[PDB]
């Protein structure tokens, strides 16, 4: 197999900045103690592609998570804050768009390459958090 469109995301990334993430978690419904501990985390993100399967791992002092998925195909995900959600991830003009649905709620996580950074935009009902990763 040759190059994949998600290949621009492949690599090991480290969180270098975060804005409004506490407010975002509040809007998602995250409880106090989880918000405080999760907000301290400086996770590493490891993204790989094998054929049609994309894997995104997050390693931190808070939790280690891993999702593997095929674009456009819904899957089960247990989030770092231990929500049990139904997730679909697609590629839209070079942006990975991740929708999570649970308990009649929805949130959208967009991951995009900007310069040498991986920028993560987390949106819930008007609240947006921007998390910036650099190569590790
Ligand atoms: O950093 C992200 O892209 C991110 C986006 C949405 C939810 C969680 C996220 N990461 C994370 C948060 C706390 C502990 C460990 C990892």
UniProtKB/Swiss-Prot annotation:
The modification N-acetylcysteine is found at residue 6. InterPro entries: Calycin (IPR012674), Fatty_acid-bd (IPR000463), ILBP (IPR031259), Lipocln_cytosolic_FA-bd_dom (IPR000566). A fatty acid binds at residues 131-133. The lineage of its organism: Eukaryota, Metazoa, Chordata, Craniata, Vertebrata. It is found in: Cytoplasm; Nucleus. A motif (Nuclear localization signal) lies at residues 26-36. The modification Phosphoserine is found at residue 17. Belongs to the calycin superfamily. Fatty-acid binding protein (FABP) family. Gene3D superfamilies: 2.40.128.20. Lipid transport protein in adipocytes. Binds both long chain fatty acids and retinoic acid. Delivers long-chain fatty acids and retinoic acid to their cognate receptors in the nucleus. This is Fatty acid-binding protein, adipocyte. The modification Phosphotyrosine is found at residue 24. Monomer. Homodimer. Interacts with PPARG. GO terms for biological process: brown fat cell differentiation; cellular response to lithium ion; cellular response to tumor necrosis factor; cholesterol homeostasis; fatty acid transport; long-chain fatty acid transport; negative regulation of DNA-templated transcription; positive regulation of cold-induced thermogenesis. Keywords: Acetylation, Cytoplasm, Lipid-binding, Nucleus, Phosphoprotein, Transport. One of its GO terms (cellular component) is lipid droplet. Its main location: cytoplasm. It comes from Homo sapiens (Human).
